[PDB]
Design a protein around this nucleic acid. Structure first.
Lengths: 129, 46, 174, 50, 150
RNA sequence: CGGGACCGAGGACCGCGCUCUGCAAGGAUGCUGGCGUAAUGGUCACCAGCGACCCGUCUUGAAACACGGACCAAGGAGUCAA
RNA sequence: GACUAAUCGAACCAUCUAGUAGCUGGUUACCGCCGAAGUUUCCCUCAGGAUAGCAGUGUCGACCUUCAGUUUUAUGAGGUAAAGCGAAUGAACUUUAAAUAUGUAAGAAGCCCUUGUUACUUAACUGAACGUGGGCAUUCGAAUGUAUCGACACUAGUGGGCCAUUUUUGGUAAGCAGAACUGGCGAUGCGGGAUGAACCGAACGCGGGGUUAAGGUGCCGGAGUGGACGCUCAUCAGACACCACAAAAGGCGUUAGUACAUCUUGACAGCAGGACGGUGGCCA
RNA sequence: GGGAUGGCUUGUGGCGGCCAAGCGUUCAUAGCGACGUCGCUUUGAUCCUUCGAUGUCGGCUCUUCCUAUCAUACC
């Protein structure tokens, strides 16, 4: 797999080399590629200092770089938003196009006919013996 | 390796930061044999 | 630790596709209120069945009242408490009219005699002794004695603290 | 007060002590209230309280 | 104490002219009344440019007016809250109706010789109280030695 | 349904209303007494309860150290030009 | 290095001369509105510099676009806890999956489709770059908040300070020494810790009433010799303790427990009695 | 022109080995470990081996305190 200038990549230093490696801040970070070399790549990372952002450039080898899926969900949601909007226009019915956060659970009833509860002590009596 | 923005701007295309130390080493080694060959030639003249 | 109540708390893990009917778990929690009861219940399930609160739900919380609160009873309490040496067993006996009163007396007793707080004490069993021969401790065996009757020597009389001065010296004989 | 709970209180409009607000229960709001738990007391109000 | 992370901001705009010109004060009163009692945003913009200072009111030349008079603007009344200057490079002044704060003598003479009309801003407020059929023009703001040296 | 404290901003009308001859409805009125002067109020001196380091200045991060101050009057220190 | 008019390692007098100092001292009414700062990055350092950042006055621009030290969703780092192995296989096992905070992305300024060129690239009109035209407004495509905009101009102080929590790297006989984030202080009053740079509560216009926080209610001292159950008697108890002395320490102090063991086939303590014979066992 | 370690200390060495009651461990049998003990540091001898001031103390005169007691008192 080759990398090109402009895409978004993750930096994960693989292997057991993380013993005396100097700079562990950029492990697990995500950035934009600005320079490509055969076995190295240039990554633009941002760091927060108090109230501002400071840009940094790092040179990371290829085996510690994987492509990112940051925009995958956005491009997907755009695709099915267009598709279900066209389907809703074809069928003449409304449909939800916005994500909603998780709602509280509603009222329901749980039967104990075949699911009689088990009484638990703070420690197990099998462990006491 | 972190790199300076000015250093990357002044860096020629194709060259990387992973060869700067080898470049400096080759420069020092070349100067060393230049001095050594001058000394050898002067000793040969003597 | 306070005006406690015994709560039957039944909870479970949230139903999934792989497990549509999860098992239910029931405990008896001595807690000041229902929020504390549910918190203790989730703490105990995290310690025992590795069921977290976010992946579970409370099915039922009920109050267990004493069946005969007007009957004098003897209770044996088996507990484990934590000191800096570690966890220690303890069996103790309390003479009360309810399990909740026995548990509050136990908490006050452990606080007084071993400086143990609420968090370091695990109540493992509270049982009502069915027979007098089941009583083991001498400080309850002397109270379940036959034809028990004692006087009350040296009783300081109740005098109002707002009455600073008294014309007569009090007596300690009634 | 740390900056993240300060920002969450500013977004919840709890900018003074003894300020009260109504919040609809979602996960997105529940996590915010759980973060600012060391500064607030919250619960489920009845019709009389409302 | 109230936690105010954000700060209430005082206005960064002129609410009154710094000039002591009494006629400018009368014009400001008139256009305050117009901007309070009319729909038209033209009156509000004119009141604003009456508040503005001299570097914020660069002069407008007759050649600039003639440039903007093209393409269907030949009958619109030209409104410039600035000084209208004369241009020697414009040999033929077209017929125009211009209202301004002040004209130079050559600009006024050349407009009246071409056959147009020169108006003041109170005459403009009398004849077009809503700013109907008007071309609002401004001079080059950045054409200054200081702005070049910025 | 009682018992108590503090407060009365505004000054024609307009409004929302109600239990609708009117009202507790967009902010106090009604009745009565004593006195009409040092009585209220104010200033100064002193006692009492509580509170309260001696000012600049300097240093660094800050104190401490250090330095100046017996008292009073009059001068007395970011001006002018290019 | 003595003396040369109380003046000598260079006399006295006037002048240049109001000589120079980066060092010391001082620098004059009131009220109102804002209001700070300590390696960010570069230069050979000390007898070093700029510079980022943080601020105030003016303005002007459609004060237009909305953005945000926050959560959620998707995906990374942390797979690390955990459940199972009647799923396979054996922290390095996995269907599944931790807590803390943390990186990127979440629209009309966007998403694709089509046409060409390519001086990029590819075996290649193939990907992509640049243009071209079209489709998507039927909802503008999470939550919450939003007197929070932008751009110039001019002006000023401070820009290798102190303390503390957390994380991390080293250590010492013990002390401790670096960094990273955040909070406080220098600039700050109030209530409480008897008292006070670093503690707790809480931030400040002038007043009245009410209610509290931290801390308190025997007196000083406002508020309880309040209530319940226990423990402790110290020949300077203890009441703001956690550190040290200090140890697996010493106690015939006092309670509550745990484990093992004995006990009417008589336990523990006592009293009355027995405590024998080979045998003065061998050597010395 | 500035400037002028501290609830510390006390009576019993260090290094190396062994034992060790105990702590842990008992899918690994490792690791901490007091009390001890063993190695290195002249038949009452020799007197022919004194091993470096950067660090400063004294003295009167007089009073008081501590006890970690030389004497006096008791045991």
């Amino acid at each position: 797999r080759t990398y090109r200038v402009g895409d978004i990549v993750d930096i994960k230093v693989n292997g057991a080399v993380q013993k005396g490696m100097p700079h562990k801040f950029y492990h697990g970070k995500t950035g934009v590629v600005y320079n490509v070399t055969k076995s190295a790549v240039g990554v633009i990372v941002y760091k927060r200092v108090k109230h501002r952002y400071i840009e940094k450039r790092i040179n990371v080898r290829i085996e510690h770089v994987k492509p990112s899926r940051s925009r995958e969900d956005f491009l997907r949601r755009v695709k099915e938003n267009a598709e279900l909007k066209k389907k809703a226009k074809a069928e003449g019915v409304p449909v939800q196009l916005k994500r909603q956060p998780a709602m509280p659970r509603e009222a329901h009833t749980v039967s104990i006919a075949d699911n009689k509860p088990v009484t638990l002590a703070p420690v197990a009596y099998e462990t006491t013996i | 390796i972190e790199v300076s923005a000015a250093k990357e701007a002044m860096r020629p295309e194709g060259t990387s930061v992973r060869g700067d130390k080898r470049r400096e080493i080759r420069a020092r080694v070349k100067k060393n044999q230049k001095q050594m060959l001058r000394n050898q030639r002067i000793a040969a003249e003597k | 630790m306070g005006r406690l109540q015994e709560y039957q708390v039944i909870g479970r893990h949230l139903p999934t596709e792989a497990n549509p009917n999860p098992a239910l778990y029931r405990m008896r929690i001595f807690a000041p209120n229902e929020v504390v009861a549910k918190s203790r219940f989730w703490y105990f399930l995290r310690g025992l069945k590795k069921v977290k609160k976010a992946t579970g739900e409370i099915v039922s919380v009920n109050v267990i009242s004493e069946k005969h609160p007007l009957k004098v009873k003897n209770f044996g309490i088996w507990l484990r408490y934590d000191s800096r040496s570690g966890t220690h067993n303890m069996y103790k006996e309390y003479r009360e009219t309810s399990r909740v009163a026995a548990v509050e007396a136990m908490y006050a007793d452990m606080a007084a005699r071993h400086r143990a707080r609420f968090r370091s004490i695990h109540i493992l069993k509270v049982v009502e002794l069915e027979k007098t021969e089941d009583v083991k401790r001498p400080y309850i065996k002397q109270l379940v004695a036959k034809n028990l009757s004692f006087p009350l020597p040296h009783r300081v009389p109740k005098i109002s603290t707002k009455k600073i001065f008294s014309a007569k010296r009090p007596s300690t004989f009634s | 007060i740390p900056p993240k709970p300060r920002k969450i209180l500013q977004l919840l409009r709890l900018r003074q002590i003894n300020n009260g607000v109504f919040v609809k229960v979602t996960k997105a709001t529940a996590e915010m209230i759980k973060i600012v738990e060391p500064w607030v007391a919250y619960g489920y109000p009845n019709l009389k309280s409302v | 104490g109230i936690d105010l992370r954000w700060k209430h901001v005082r206005s960064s705009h002129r609410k009154a002219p710094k000039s002591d010109n009494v006629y400018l004060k009368l014009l400001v009163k008139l256009y305050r009344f117009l901007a309070r009692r009319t729909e038209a945003p033209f009156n509000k913009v004119v009141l604003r440019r009456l508040f503005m200072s001299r570097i914020n009111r660069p002069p407008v030349s007759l050649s600039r007016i003639a440039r903007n008079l093209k393409n269907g603007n030949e009958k619109k009344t030209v409104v410039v809250v600035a000084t209208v200057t004369d241009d020697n490079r414009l040999l033929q002044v077209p017929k125009m109706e211009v209202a301004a704060l002040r004209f130079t003598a050559k600009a006024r003479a050349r407009i009246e010789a071409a056959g147009g009309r020169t108006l003041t801003l109170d005459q403009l407020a009398l004849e077009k109280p809503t700013g109907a059929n008007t071309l609002l023009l401004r001079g080059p703001k950045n054409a200054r030695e200081a702005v070049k040296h910025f």
